[PDB]
Amino acid sequence: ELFLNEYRKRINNEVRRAAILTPTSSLREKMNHKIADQILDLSSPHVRGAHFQAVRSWTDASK
């Protein structure tokens, strides 16, 4: 759970890096290339985030 949260934090840090190294004139294209898909992959159901409990079935916990 902490590792999935680490994934989300790393993708957020890379978005912050893109916000600085890339001007707004072309940031959204490069972000929609690969980063946006991973951001939506690491979202509220897929990672616990700030939630009290990550509601996983036993199969999901085993995975």
Partner 1 sequence: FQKYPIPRYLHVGQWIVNKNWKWNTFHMFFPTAILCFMVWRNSMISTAKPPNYGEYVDPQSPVAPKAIKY
Partner 2 sequence: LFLLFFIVNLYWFNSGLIFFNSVYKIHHDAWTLIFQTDSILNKLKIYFFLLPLYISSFIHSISTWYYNYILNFLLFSENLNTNTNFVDYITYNTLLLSKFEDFNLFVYIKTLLITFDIRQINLDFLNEYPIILLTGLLFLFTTIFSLICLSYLGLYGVFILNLASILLFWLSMLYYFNLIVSENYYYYISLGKWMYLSNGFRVSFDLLIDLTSISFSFLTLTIGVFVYIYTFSYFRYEPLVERLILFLNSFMISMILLVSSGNFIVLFLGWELIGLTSFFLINFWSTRVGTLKAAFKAFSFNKLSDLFLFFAILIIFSTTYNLDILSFNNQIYLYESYNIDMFYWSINLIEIISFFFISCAFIKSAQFGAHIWLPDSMEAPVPASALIHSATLVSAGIYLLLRLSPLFELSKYAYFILPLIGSVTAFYGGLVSAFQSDTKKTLAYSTISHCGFLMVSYSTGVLEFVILYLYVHGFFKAATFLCVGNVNRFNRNIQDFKRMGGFYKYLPFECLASFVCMINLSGLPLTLGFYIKHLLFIGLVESYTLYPLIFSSLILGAIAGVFYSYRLFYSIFFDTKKGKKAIYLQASRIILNSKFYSNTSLASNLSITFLVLISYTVILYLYCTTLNNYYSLSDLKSIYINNAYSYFYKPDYNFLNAVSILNWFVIILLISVIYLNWRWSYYYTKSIDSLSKFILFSFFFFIFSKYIL
Partner 3 sequence: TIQEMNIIYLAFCWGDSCAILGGILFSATHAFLSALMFFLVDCIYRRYHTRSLVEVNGILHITPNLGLSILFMLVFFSGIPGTIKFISEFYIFSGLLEASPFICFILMLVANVLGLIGFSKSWFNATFGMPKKNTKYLPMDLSFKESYIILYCFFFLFIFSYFSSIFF
Binding-site ranges for partner 2 (CB under 8 A): 1-2, 5-6, 8-9, 12-13, 15-16, 18-20, 23-25, 27-28, 31, 36, 39-40, 44, 47-51
Look up residue 41 and give its two tokens: 């992959």
Q: Which stretch binds partner 1 (CB under 8 A): 29-37, 45-53, 54-62?
A: 29-37
**End-to-end CA, the chain:** 11
- When the beta carbons of 38 and 54 are compared against partner 1, the nearer one is 38
Residue 16 is given by DSSP the state H
Asked whether position 5 contacts partner 1 by CB under 8 A, the answer is: no
CA distance linking residue 12 with residue 38, whole number of Å: 10
